[PDB]
Design a protein around this ligand. Structure first.
Ligand SMILES: [Mg+2]
Ligand SMILES: [Mg+2]
Ligand SMILES: [Mg+2]
Ligand SMILES: [Mg+2]
Ligand SMILES: [Mg+2]
Ligand SMILES: [Mg+2]
Ligand SMILES: [Mg+2]
Ligand SMILES: [Mg+2]
Ligand SMILES: [Mg+2]
Ligand SMILES: [Mg+2]
Ligand SMILES: [Mg+2]
Ligand SMILES: [Mg+2]
Ligand SMILES: [Mg+2]
Ligand SMILES: [Mg+2]
Ligand SMILES: [Mg+2]
Ligand SMILES: [Mg+2]
Ligand SMILES: [Mg+2]
Ligand SMILES: [Mg+2]
Ligand SMILES: [Mg+2]
Ligand SMILES: [Mg+2]
Ligand SMILES: [Mg+2]
Ligand SMILES: [Mg+2]
Ligand SMILES: [Mg+2]
Ligand SMILES: [Mg+2]
Ligand SMILES: [Mg+2]
Ligand SMILES: [Mg+2]
Ligand SMILES: [Mg+2]
Ligand SMILES: [Mg+2]
Ligand SMILES: [Mg+2]
Ligand SMILES: [Mg+2]
Ligand SMILES: [Mg+2]
Ligand SMILES: [Mg+2]
Ligand SMILES: [Mg+2]
Ligand SMILES: [Mg+2]
Ligand SMILES: [Mg+2]
Ligand SMILES: [Mg+2]
Ligand SMILES: [Mg+2]
Ligand SMILES: [Mg+2]
Ligand SMILES: [Mg+2]
Ligand SMILES: [Mg+2]
Ligand SMILES: [Mg+2]
Ligand SMILES: [Mg+2]
Ligand SMILES: [Mg+2]
Ligand SMILES: [Mg+2]
Ligand SMILES: [Mg+2]
Lengths: 65, 273
RNA sequence: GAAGACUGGAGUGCAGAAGAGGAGAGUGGAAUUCCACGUGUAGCGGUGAAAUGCGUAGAUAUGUGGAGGAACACCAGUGGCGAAGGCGACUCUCUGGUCUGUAACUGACGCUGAGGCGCGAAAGCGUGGGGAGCAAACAGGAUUAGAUACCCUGGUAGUCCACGCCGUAAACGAUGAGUGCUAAGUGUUAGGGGGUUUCCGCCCCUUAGUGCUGCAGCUAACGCAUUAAGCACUCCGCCUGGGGAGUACGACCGCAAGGUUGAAACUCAAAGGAAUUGACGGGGGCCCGCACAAGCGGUGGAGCAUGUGGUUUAAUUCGAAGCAAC
């Protein structure tokens, strides 16, 4: 459970923070559902856009392995 | 675009034409005009060898640059004009030297651009490059067959060819007719499709308008006499009472392949149309 | 009706929030297809079975590179936005609406709305680009008594884009718009206030959406029930037994297919909604029986007795017809 972002108070999810985003993707680069990481709805949407942006600039793998 | 006419008369009922929207000027470069004279299909001996020709509006040849052998000199596009001697339009180009030449106006060419020829030129519309410098997959036109001769292959309005692959001294190219052809890598070509793409939609609408371009009426062989055509003769309307439709000189005309059966360039053609 | 006054309805200002709302211009990665070149050999594909089909001019498989079109895996959720149709890759530009708080401002400026004007899935039409997959018509191979179908192999218009038409749908919540009043319980989306608390977190109050369960009340019943099908007020659209029939005639619109408006003669004594009790299903669960399994031994094979059919005869007397006649 517990929203990771709300618990730590971070209110801006950025696509450059490639080390943070890798927590919420699978080992293959797929985004994980909010019913597994437990993050709240308002922040899952922000997370999805940031991952899609940084996927484009080779910071994250589209399909990995 | 294409301009339609209201049916004010029966001869203008279905006639269409071009609006000439892309043509900039109307006065040719007087230093690049040469005279022509109609031949009407007449021969060296004065005989008629090719029929249905002769008797149109008089024209004047203007020399086109197919070789494109001025290398390293930037050239600015000045005007886009009308050439009666060919289907595509032409563009007047004055290089930085002060030398003026005509080329075939490609699609997307407009006044004010700059073009180059050589080995340092970019892959841009209007540039001329040797085929060994053109990457595979690009669309080219004005292909030439022998080095240093001048473009011959793809020149008509709205036509294009594509580079398929390189295999050494030669290059595979898919011509506009749809055959993969193999030509030398030292020949030149121009990037881009040819300009006047809408030329094939024009409806003549009149017999006189067809006569303006220098065409004479075509008589079907079925209405001739037995000594005039293999189809001639017969009481009433008659069918083709033969094994095959025939040309005026014999030699069946429907399906019969006429390419020479022992041609030298057969090895340089991969697949036919 | 006329002249004044007010702020709660309505709107503006100020401060915040969320969103696949729209149009244009670019860009990205998986995958099917095609092309060029490495390696390799006789198969590949398909079905309930097979054939058509592709393959020794060397495929299917595999590695590298290129071309082009279309749709956007996970996120994804009785989640969100829009008046309805509808809108899911990313970035930028131009844009419409909505919700919460404040009480700064105007001071009834409001609701509904026949004729009118716009938007309106998919198919379809006109001019022109584009065409990778899929696929009406169609061709071939199957199936069957026949198969103008379902199945297999291909395949054109079409599906895509620009502009102009069309004006329809189970266009559905089968439920017109506005406003007020009438028990509760519990999820979720976007906000606001307060208690506890170093934050974190838990609880209570509240506004606008989106679901489930339920009292009064309503309903023929099913069921609806603060997102009413309850109790009331204002304006609009529509109905008056079934067929003929959304037909004919007239009119308006359309390039065309057609669309909107729209009867009568004649004929029937019914058409219809919901729920009940059976019966049935090439619907689903559970139990039983020499019903299958585990056995032992027969029949169908050969020779005869014997009953039936068939057939032959003047007669071959009549009745029995899967199980349940022989
Ligand atoms: Mg001729
Ligand atoms: Mg011309
Ligand atoms: Mg005659
Ligand atoms: Mg003869
Ligand atoms: Mg004859
Ligand atoms: Mg006759
Ligand atoms: Mg107000
Ligand atoms: Mg949007
Ligand atoms: Mg292969
Ligand atoms: Mg709405
Ligand atoms: Mg006042
Ligand atoms: Mg209204
Ligand atoms: Mg109206
Ligand atoms: Mg459509
Ligand atoms: Mg197919
Ligand atoms: Mg309707
Ligand atoms: Mg619908
Ligand atoms: Mg609703
Ligand atoms: Mg209706
Ligand atoms: Mg109702
Ligand atoms: Mg009502
Ligand atoms: Mg109401
Ligand atoms: Mg209300
Ligand atoms: Mg109400
Ligand atoms: Mg709620
Ligand atoms: Mg509450
Ligand atoms: Mg809302
Ligand atoms: Mg509610
Ligand atoms: Mg009532
Ligand atoms: Mg209920
Ligand atoms: Mg109330
Ligand atoms: Mg509802
Ligand atoms: Mg009712
Ligand atoms: Mg009525
Ligand atoms: Mg009636
Ligand atoms: Mg009647
Ligand atoms: Mg019933
Ligand atoms: Mg047994
Ligand atoms: Mg045994
Ligand atoms: Mg046994
Ligand atoms: Mg046994
Ligand atoms: Mg025995
Ligand atoms: Mg008997
Ligand atoms: Mg009997
Ligand atoms: Mg029976």
């Amino acid at each position: 459970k517990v929203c990771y972002f709300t618990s730590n108070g971070i209110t801006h999810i950025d696509y450059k923070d490639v080390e943070l985003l890798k927590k919420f993707v699978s080992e293959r680069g797929k985004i994980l559902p909010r019913r597994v990481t437990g993050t709240s709805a308002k922040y899952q949407r922000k997370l999805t856009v940031a991952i899609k942006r940084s996927r484009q600039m080779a910071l994250l793998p589209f399909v990995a392995e | 675009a294409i301009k339609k006419y209201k049916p004010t008369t029966n001869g203008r009922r279905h006639m269409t034409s071009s609006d000439f929207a892309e043509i900039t000027t109307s006065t040719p470069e007087k230093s690049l005009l040469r005279p022509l004279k109609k031949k009407a299909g007449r021969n060296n001996q004065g005989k008629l060898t090719v029929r249905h020709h002769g008797g149109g509006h008089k024209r004047q040849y203007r020399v086109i640059d197919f070789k494109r052998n001025k290398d390293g000199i930037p050239g600015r596009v000045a005007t886009i004009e009308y050439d009666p001697n060919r289907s595509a339009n032409i563009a007047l180009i004055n290089y930085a030297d002060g030398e003026k030449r005509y080329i075939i106006a490609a699609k997307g060419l407009e006044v004010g651009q700059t073009i180059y020829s050589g080995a340092e030129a970019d892959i841009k519309v209007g540039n001329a490059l040797e085929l060994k410098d053109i990457p595979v997959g690009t669309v080219i036109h004005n292909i030439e067959m022998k080095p240093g001769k001048g473009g011959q292959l793809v020149r008509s309005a709205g036509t294009s060819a594509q580079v398929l692959g390189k295999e050494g001294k030669y290059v595979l190219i898919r011509l506009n007719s749809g055959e993969v052809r193999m030509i030398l890598a030292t020949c030149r070509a121009t990037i881009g499709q040819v300009g006047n793409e809408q030329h094939e939609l024009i409806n003549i609408g009149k017999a006189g308008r067809s006569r303006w371009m220098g065409k004479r009426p075509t008589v079907r062989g079925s209405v001739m006499n037995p000594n005039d055509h293999p189809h001639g003769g017969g009481e009433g309307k008659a069918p083709i009472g033969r094994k095959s439709p025939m040309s005026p000189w014999g030699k069946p005309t429907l399906g019969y392949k006429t390419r020479k059966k022992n041609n030298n360039s057969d090895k340089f053609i991969v697949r036919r149309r």
